[model samples]
Target chain A: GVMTGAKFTQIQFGMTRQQVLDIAGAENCETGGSFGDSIHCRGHAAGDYYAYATFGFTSAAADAKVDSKSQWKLLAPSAPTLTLAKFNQVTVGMTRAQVLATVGQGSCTTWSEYYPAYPSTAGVTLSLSCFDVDGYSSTGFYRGSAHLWFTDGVLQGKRQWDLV
Target chain B: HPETLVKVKDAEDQLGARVGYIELDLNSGKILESFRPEERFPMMSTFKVLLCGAVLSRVDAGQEQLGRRIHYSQNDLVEYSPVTEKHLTDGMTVRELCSAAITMSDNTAANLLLTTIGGPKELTAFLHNMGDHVTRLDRWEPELNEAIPNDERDTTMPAAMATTLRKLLTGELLTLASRQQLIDWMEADKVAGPLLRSALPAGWFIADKSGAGERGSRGIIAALGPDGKPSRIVVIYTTGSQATMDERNRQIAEIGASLIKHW
Candidate 1:
C-alpha cells in the first residue's frame, strides 16, 4: 500500500491496529506481532506512503483485534477546525469539547519543520496551508493560523506567529 | 570564584548557549557554585515534580488512593507521549501515572496528576508554600508547548527550584514516605540525559527531573554521595542556544563533570 504523506500524518498518536489497517489500506502493507500487546505495520519505503504504524500496548487487551475497540480506548477523535481567533479564544481549563466547539472537529494543522506564524491584524503574505480552504478570500492571507495545545483533554495554551 | 566556577563558565562559553545554573548542598542548603542562579528560565517538564507533590499531598491526606484506576478517553490523549499512547486502551493506575509523569516525562500523565490535585491552582499554592514566589505554571502540557517567550511562559529561577527541591528532600513539604516515593520515582526516571547523572562518580545516586524544550533545556539533579548521604543539588537551565541537541547535552555534561570534580 502506497500511502500519501497525508495518510502518514493521519496515523495519529493513539490508534489501534485494525483502525490503522482500515484507514491505511492493508494490501501491500504488513501488520504482524501480538494484536493487543504490540503490533507493527509497515509498507512502501519508510518515507513513502504512511510508512509504518507501530503500537505498544501496556495492558492485556492490547492483544485484542479490531472491533475489540478495547484495543485503543483513547483513539484520537477527528480533529477540530482551527482559526487564529478561535485558537486565541482557547485558554487553560477549557475542555476538549469546548475547544471542538470553538475550532470545529479535527486536530490542529501542523508541520514537521518550523510552524508558520499566526496571522496579523494588518494582513500578510502566507502559505496556503495556514488556513482552511475558504481562508484566502476571507482573510488577506490563505486562512486562520495558530497551534492549539491540550493536556488531559483540556485546553493548555497556543502559539501564534506571523507567516511571511 | 572557585576553580569549578571557572570551569563551569568556560563550559558555558564553549557551548555558546545562555546558561543559568546553581549547585547546592542538599543537606545544609549551601550554595556551591552559581551563575545567574536567580535568573528566570522556562521550567519545561521539570515542573512535574511539583505536580507530583500536589497529588501526593492528597494521597497523604487520605483524599486519594494510589491504586485508583484511571481510564483514558479520546480527550485524555496527547501527542509525543509514550505512556499515554502505550496504554491508551487499558489506561493506568494513579501510581502508574505518577511513575510515568516523573520517569518518562509523560505529558498526559502529568496532566492527569495535576488535574487530580485540582489543576494549576493547587500547584501554584504548593509552590508558594515552598517559597517559590517567582515560578508559576500558566498552562499544562501540550499547551505549554507553544513557543511563548520565557517571561510569558511558566518559569522559575535555578535557586528557587533548588529551594523547592531542598524542601522536598528534607521532608518539610512532604512526609518521609512521600519524599522517599518521589525521589524513588525520580531515580527511576528513564529520560534524564547525561547531564548531572553522567558526571557523577560511580556509587553516587541521583533522583532527578530534566526537560528539553524548543528554546533550550533545564534539569534538577538531586544527588547522594557515594556515602549514601545527601551530597549536592545541581540545577542547570540553558536557553537561547543556537546549538544542536548534542552540543547542548555535552555542555551540560561538562558542567556536571566539573561540579563533581570540584565538590
Candidate 2:
C-alpha cells in the first residue's frame, strides 16, 4: 500500500535517511541527484494507490535528513489487482517465488521493490506489484501488490493496504 | 603435536575431499601452520579479493579513479548477479562495483571490474609482476568455477595464495588507504563466507571471502584473530568432494576453529 497522510505526517523533519527508510520501505525510493543526494519516494500501499514525495538533504552523509518533503498528493488505487483484494489471497507458507511466477514472463506483470539486508537483527524486504504501467524497470497490467515479512523462508507477517 | 593440527586432519578426512591450507603470521611473513601447502585448488570467488586489489593498484597509480562509472546493458548480466542485475540503467561506480564483487560475490560485478583491469590473462600477468607465478586465472566466472578435477586453469596453490595475499595486504603494493579499504570491504561480508565464519568460536574477530562451485569446490581466504583487527591469515581450498556444500564448508570451518592456537 502507498503512504497515508497519517503515516506521512509522522515522518518528522531532520531525521536521517536511514530513519526515513526505517519509517517507510527503501524499495519505494529512487535515489538520484548530482551526488545521489535526492531521495524520491512513491508511498506504495495497495492496488494502484500511491503518493509521491521528495526528500531533501544537504549532503550524502549518513546523518542527512528530510530537511524537506514533497506534498502528500493523496490518490486512490485505480485497479483491484494493485489493491487489498489480491494481497488477501496471499497466504502463509506460499513461496514468494511462487507468487512471482503468477505474473507474465516479460511484459512488466510484476516487480519486487527489494531492499538489501543489513547484518544483525535484520532481513531484506521486498514488495510485489503488478501494474500495466511502466516504471521501476518493468511494464505491464496493474495486478496488485503486497507488504510482507518472512521468517525461516515462509511468509509470517504482513501489512494491510488502503482501499481508497 | 598441536591439538589444532589433529583436528584439521580429522576435519579434512571427513570432508571426503583433498585439502590444502596455510596459516600465516600476517606481519612476519612466516608460515605458522600448513598442510599440502603446495597443492592446487580453484580460486573461485576468493580471487575477487585480489581482482579488486589489482584495480586499486591502478587507482593508486592514477591509471584509474574509483569514482568513474561503467555502463552496461542487461546482456552484461551472468548468473548470480544480484547486485549488477538491478543497477543496469544508472550504471555503477568503480567503487560500488568492487564493493559488490568483494562483499556480495556478485559475478557480473566482478566480470565488469575484471574487464577494466584487462581480463583474466591480464590479471595473471599482474600477479607475475607482483611475484606470484603459481596462481593463475584462465577464464571468467561460471567457467572459472568449473573446478574440474586436475584442471590447473583458474587455480592456485595453498602457499602461493597465502603469500600473495600477504604481499598485497602487507607489502607496498597498494596504498595504505587502499589496503585498509580492502580490509573493510572484506569485513563487510556477512554472507557468502558463512561457512568459515560459523565455525569460529564466539568473540573471535575475522574478515573473510570464500567461493563455491561444481564438484563440491570450496575455498576461503581470511584474516582472523582473538579480538578485533584480526592479525593471523588463513587460507583453505578443497575440491572433488562428492558431499553436499554444507558438509564441505562445515569441515573448513572446523579447520578454522582449530587455528585458535596461533593467537
Candidate 3:
C-alpha cells in the first residue's frame, strides 16, 4: 500500500504526533498501540501504509490504508502551525527549505561533526537535525536527559523531559 | 583494581581539590567504584586525552592518512593563554599533535586535534558510550564561561576519575587495543610532579594528567597542591594561596619527593 499520489509538504510549526495525525487526516485508523516500549502500529484494515510516529515523550502509528486527510484540509485546519525551530531539535517530516528557515545556516545547523570553525577545515557535513534523533529514540528512563548540544552561534534544539 | 582506590583516596584527602573516579574492567562491565561520576568536569589540557584517542582511533580505523603535514598559523595559537599564544617554529604532523597533547598538555595542539576529531563533544560522546561517565571535553571560551558562573569551575569526583583509569587498565573501555592506547597516552603524560607519579616505585609507570585554573583574582585552584603527594600508600594536598605558578609546582614537586622517599 504505497502512498498513492501522496504529495510531500513541509512542517511549519511545532506539533505532536497526534497533531500530525489530525493534519494528515489519520486520527480514526484502528490503532494497534505500541509494541514493547516503541510506538509501532499495524492497521488491521489497510496493512500497506505503516508509519511509526514517536515524539520525545509518546508515539503512535498508522498504515497507508489510513487515509491521509486532504492536504488542503490540513492547511486550512484549525490546528496551530508550528515548526521545530529550537536548538538541536528535529522532526521526521522536515524538508530542506523548511529546515533552513528553522535553523538558519549550517554554521548554526546541527551536524554529526561540530566545532567553533565547523563546516570549514573541520570537514563537518551539516544535517538539520538540531535535536539528537538517535539518543532520543529511547524515552526509556528519566524524561530529562543530558542536553549538551550546541553550535558556534545559535542553539538548534535541546533534550527536555515529558511530564507524562 | 585495588591500586586505583589507593591513589584516588590519597589525591582527594591531600589535594584539597575535588576529584572523581570510575572503574570499568574491560573484560567485564564491573564498576567497582564511582563518586559523582555522571557530572561533567573540565579536563583542562588533560582534555587532550580525548584528542589523543580521537587521532589514533581514526588512524586505527584507516579513515585518515598519517604523516599528513599541518602548517601552524598564528590563529592556531590560543589567544590570551600564556603557554599557547606563541607561534610554532616547527610544522606539525598528526602524530606530533597527539604526542604534544599527551606530553606537553599543549592547548593549541589539542585544539588542532579537537577540530579534526569533531570537537570535544564528539570525544565526550565516545567516552560516554564506552562507559567512562565522568570526564567531558568542551571548548572553554570566554562566553562559554560567561553562562557558566565564575564559581562553577570545572570539576570531577575522584572516584569517577579512578574508575576511568581502572577501566583503561582492565580493557573495559573498548574493543581492540584502543583501550590500551589511552592508558599508554596517560602513562606518557608529562606529570613530573612527585605526588601521583612519585607514589609509584621506579619503573612502575603511572599514566596521568594534572591541571588547575581560576577565573578571577581569587579562587585559586591546583590539581595537586603541596602535601598532596604521599607515598603510594597515601595522597596529600593544600591550596588557596596567592603563590606564583612555579612556586606552587615546586612545592608540589618537593612534597611528592619527600612523601615518595619516606612513605
TM-score of each: 0.66, 0.63, 0.43
For B7-76, candidate 1 gives per-residue lDDT tens digits of 6677678766667878888888888778888887777778888788777777888988889988875355
Candidate with the larger DockQ of 2 and 3? 2
Candidate 1 retains true contacts at a fraction of 0.00
DockQ of 2: 0.03
The lDDT per prediction is: 0.60, 0.66, 0.38
Residue-wise C-alpha lDDT for candidate 3, range A1-164, written one tens digit per residue: 21111211321123444554444345322232111222122211110012222211122332212111111011111121122333334333444455445433331221122222312334212222222222221111111112222233333333332211
Using lDDT as the measure, the top candidate is: 2
Per-residue C-alpha lDDT of model 3 across residues B67-161, encoded as one tens digit per residue: 76567643344311212222233467777666655654555567777777787688777678767666565554211221133222333333444
In candidate 1, position B165 carries an lDDT of 80
| Per-residue lDDT value at B222 in model 3 | 21
Candidate RMSDs in order = 11.3, 13.8, 23.3
Best-to-worst lDDT order? 2, 1, 3
Cα lDDT tens digits, model 2, B1-263, are: 16667766776778767888888888997898888899899998899988999999999999989999999854455544545655655799999988888876777799999999999999999999999999999998656877878899999998999988888888999999999888888877734444667766678777778887667678889987876767778998888877765577678877766666434
Model 1 stretches with alpha carbons more than 4 Å out:
A1-54, A57-164, B145-147, B150-152
**DockQ list for all candidates:** 0.05, 0.03, 0.01
Between the candidate structures 2 and 3, which one is better when assessed by TM-score?
Answer: 2
Residue runs of model 2 more than 4 Å from their true location after superposition = A1-164, B201-203
